[PDB]
Ligand binder design. Structure first.
Ligand SMILES: [Cu+2]
Ligand SMILES: [Cu+2]
Length: 439
């Protein structure tokens, strides 16, 4: 093991993972001063949980914060009476989450808070961690002998030894920070010992986007948010919006040292300037480039061949209803809407039936990018902007630029009441969420 850090791992044993985890304030040392964050298990990021299909999970959460909280199990297809967005745990009390892992699941998932009105300050302060589901496909020679790592992407900012407070502009644009970190560290070094790598990737930031590229190399895509592709797909760069995940293979062919970067991207945020003229002044424009890590290749590298096939994607029944959902903005007031209204936890917006399939059309009539998320029921993307999607795999977040319409196929699984919302989490707290009931 070189000198590259990753979070501590907890694994199942005899078919069961049973753990007591506390949410607490903690002092750390990360930039140049004393810093007290809010953490799970005393670390930033929290610990990684690792399981297999048909295992039982029993997680007891102990609240030692000065305000109430709960958990969302992002991407898991389980009952909404377990993954419950309306529950509240008071200061000083505990609650146990119990479920079984579904039979055909594989990939990278995560856990974080979801108490409406307080999501954005609690996630910015440090509360998140990863969950990994192993597969029988991981045994084939082209994956078994690769060098494997997890990369958690998240940014931060400090004031007076605490996380910086939210400002009026933050509720409008969403909050970014100046310290851009990997696995809790500023620009770490990875000294590789093999020529083929398998990297699992997670965007756990409040609002920042990452346009990823490795100097002098392409990337080979093998999984999306919620499962494997049908075969590997070669790309030259890869955009990841807040809440999305992916897995890739890298093939090193020459000695050297190579930068992994987040390249310039314009997500439509609005700026602060005063009367000084240019030729493009009012929006913020594209981001500045950032260096994520340094990657050093081994001596005389010889990479492995690619796998020929992965997992076939299932066929689904024909649909019986169509929905249309339109997103809009009021920027100076920082208020955000779905079909002309804001969230109300006592109102039901859609009613569907278990064991049927629906077509959902989601349209962006604003000027900013917005990334759309649905709880409990994963989906297949068919097209964006009237043009075809490039692969077949399970997803749970889809990005939309200004003007774009996405078409989705949605099979309805577990019964009960759940939600859908934007994952720029400041926009969720300020109105952009609604309610679905399945009977
Ligand atoms: Cu989430
Ligand atoms: Cu939004």
């Amino acid at each position: 093991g070189p000198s590259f850090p990753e979070p501590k791992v907890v694994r199942s044993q005899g078919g069961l993972l049973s753990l007591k985890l506390s949410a607490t304030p903690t002092p750390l040392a990360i930039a140049g001063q004393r810093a007290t964050l809010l953490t799970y298990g005393g670390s930033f990021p929290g610990p990684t949980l690792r399981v297999r299909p048909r295992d039982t999970v029993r997680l007891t959460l102990e609240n030692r914060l000065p305000e109430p909280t709960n958990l969302h199990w992002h991407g898991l297809p389980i009952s909404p009476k377990v993954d419950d967005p309306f529950l509240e745990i008071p200061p000083g009390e505990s609650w146990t989450y119990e479920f079984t892992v579904p039979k055909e699941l594989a990939g990278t998932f995560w856990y974080h808070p979801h108490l409406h009105g307080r999501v954005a300050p609690q996630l910015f302060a440090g509360l998140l961690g990863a969950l990994v589901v192993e597969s029988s496909l991981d045994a084939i020679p082209e994956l078994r002998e690769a060098e494997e790592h997890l990369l958690v992407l998240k940014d931060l900012a400090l004031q007076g030894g605490r996380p910086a407070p939210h400002t009026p502009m933050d509720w409008m644009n969403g909050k970014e920070g100046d310290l851009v970190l990997v696995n809790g560290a500023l620009r770490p070094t990875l000294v590789a010992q093999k020529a083929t790598l398998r990297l699992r990737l997670l965007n756990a930031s409040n609002a920042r986007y990452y346009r990823l590229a490795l100097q002098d190399h392409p990337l080979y895509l093998i999984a999306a948010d919620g499962g494997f592709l049908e075969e590997p797909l070669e790309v030259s760069e890869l955009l990841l919006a807040p809440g999305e995940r992916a897995e890739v293979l890298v093939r090193l062919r020459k000695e050297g040292r190579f930068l992994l970067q987040a390249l310039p991207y314009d997500r439509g945020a609005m700026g602060m300037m005063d009367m000084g003229g240019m030729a493009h002044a009012m929006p913020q424009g594209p981001s500045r480039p950032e260096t994520l890590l340094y990657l050093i290749a081994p001596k005389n590298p010889k990479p492995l061949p690619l796998p020929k096939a992965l997992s076939p994607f299932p066929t689904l029944p024909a649909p019986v209803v169509t929905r249309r959902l339109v997103l809009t903005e009021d920027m100076m007031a920082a208020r955000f809407f779905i079909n002309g209204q804001v969230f109300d936890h006592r109102r039901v917006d859609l009613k569907g039936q278990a064991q049927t399939v629906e077509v959902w059309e989601v349209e962006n009539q604003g000027d900013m990018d917005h990334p759309f998320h649905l709880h409990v029921h994963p989906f297949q993307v068919l097209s964006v902007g009237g043009r075809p999607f490039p692969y077949r795999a399970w997803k749970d977040v889809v990005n939309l630029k200004a003007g774009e319409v996405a078409r989705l196929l949605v099979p309805l699984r577990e019964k009960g009441r759940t939600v859908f919302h934007c994952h720029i989490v400041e926009h969720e707290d300020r109105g952009m969420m609604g309610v679905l009931e399945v009977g």
